[PDB]
Design an enzyme around this catalytic site. Structure first.
Site, PDB file in Angstrom:
ATOM      1  CE  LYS A   1      -3.838  -2.734   1.429  1.00 36.39           C
ATOM      2  NZ  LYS A   1      -4.393  -3.666   2.529  1.00 36.39           N
TER       3      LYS A   1
ATOM      4  CB  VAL B   1     -13.971 -11.245   3.956  1.00 31.74           C
ATOM      5  CG1 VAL B   1     -14.801 -12.531   4.215  1.00 31.74           C
ATOM      6  CG2 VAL B   1     -14.437 -10.528   2.652  1.00 31.74           C
TER       7      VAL B   1
ATOM      8  N   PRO C   1     -18.457 -12.917   2.858  1.00 33.24           N
ATOM      9  CG  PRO C   1     -17.302 -14.917   3.265  1.00 33.24           C
ATOM     10  CD  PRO C   1     -18.273 -13.914   3.924  1.00 33.24           C
ATOM     11  N   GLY C   2     -20.162 -13.765   0.580  1.00 32.10           N
ATOM     12  CA  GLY C   2     -21.153 -13.693  -0.488  1.00 32.10           C
ATOM     13  C   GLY C   2     -21.562 -12.304  -0.907  1.00 32.10           C
TER      14      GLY C   2
ATOM     15  NE  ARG D   1      -7.465  -9.627  11.570  1.00 35.83           N
ATOM     16  CZ  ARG D   1      -8.091  -8.519  11.933  1.00 35.83           C
ATOM     17  NH1 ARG D   1      -8.171  -8.169  13.229  1.00 35.83           N
ATOM     18  NH2 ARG D   1      -8.588  -7.717  11.022  1.00 35.83           N
TER      19      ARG D   1
END
Lengths: 215, 215
Positions: free
Chosen positions: B62, B172, B179-180, B193
């Site tokens: 980044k 997420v 996720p979805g 994690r």
């Protein structure tokens, strides 16, 4: 800092970085080491420099991640011996607080970068910089970084942080900034290429210090 | 990416990082490595992972420095074997172009981070994110990173970059993202994690993939 001058050691190979730092050591006592040197030669270069030159090391990592990651980066950086780390303020207060918590646990310091010195800083950073500086004051930050290339912005930054805060400033030399004008507002100036790409780095550092002393 | 899932390998010990990545390798094929692991074990860990797991490596650095410095960081990162690097867009277009120039020279890719996933991103980054995304499109950036924690912002980012651009998304699991829902807008999700701190990382990765397949 000695002579109000911090060397930005951005050469990427250890032999050249050691040669130039050694040549200018009599004029400084604080070296800023960033990713160009650390990613090329390893984090052990921080402790080597600190020991070899007996200088303070500021890690210019300009941390700009989420809190949890910033914590881990600060912990690794101080474990490596750095005296301070530079942290971006634009990601917000929780990201900055994560760094301040690790510095407090390890007895080290955080420098908050408020406005950057390059042209592109005008696009998004400049408009938020006063508010990033005021966030710093509200968090108890005492060390800041502002731009030599825009002394009017450096003056406004100094205005927000007060005279007791410590303010260092990159962009002197190569990027166009002037040592004397920048030192009207900053406590110390950061200088990289003007010294480390010079044919005689010691003479370049001495010439800068001569102009500083005259102030 | 395999299963639309990228592992964020932020453990700081080589042995633990190799154990977990090996345990979940059958479910992924792209690993994101950042400073927590690289500053603790060295840049050579990138080539080691690429060879040992035959996975692509995205360097989560980044980058948020001035152009000249961003160039040096990108050069060092690709020399180390990374396939791509994540770059902040907030510092402006010249900083991003410096990274794109090195990626073009080395045959690699740049991912532009537009809005971050943590709470503090709302202070300064969010207000500039649509413009940072439009700057990316204007510069020809084709790979982007946006937040799982704010799907309405991820949708707006997808709207700006179009359907042809590749969009990956962190936040997420641990940070609260789903996720979805995130995959309604992003092409792949980043998970750290929730997988690497799990008692059984392979089972955690498998459970995420089962929810993905069902989309």
């Amino acid at each position: 800092v000695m002579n109000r001058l911090i060397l930005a050691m951005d050469l990427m190979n250890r032999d050249d970085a050691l040669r130039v730092t050694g040549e200018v050591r009599e004029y400084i006592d604080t070296v800023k080491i960033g990713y160009p040197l650390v990613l090329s030669e390893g984090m052990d270069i921080i402790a080597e420099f600190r020991k070899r030159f007996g200088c303070r090391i500021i890690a210019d990592f300009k941390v700009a991640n989420i809190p949890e990651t910033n914590e881990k980066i600060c912990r690794a950086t101080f474990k490596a011996g750095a005296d301070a780390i530079i942290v971006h303020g634009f990601p917000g207060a929780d990201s900055v607080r994560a760094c301040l918590n690790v510095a407090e646990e390890m007895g080290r310091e955080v420098f908050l970068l408020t406005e950057m010195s390059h042209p592109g800083a005008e696009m998004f950073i400049q408009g938020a910089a006063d508010e990033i500086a005021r966030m710093g004051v509200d968090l108890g930050v005492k060390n800041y970084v502002g731009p030599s290339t825009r002394p009017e912005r450096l003056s406004r930054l100094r205005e927000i942080i007060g005279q007791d805060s410590f303010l260092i400033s990159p962009g002197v030399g190569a990027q166009g900034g002037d040592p004397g004008e920048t030192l009207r507002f900053a406590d110390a100036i950061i200088v990289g290429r003007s010294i480390y790409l010079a044919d005689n780095p010691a003479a370049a550092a001495a010439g800068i210090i001569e102009s500083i002393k005259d102030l």
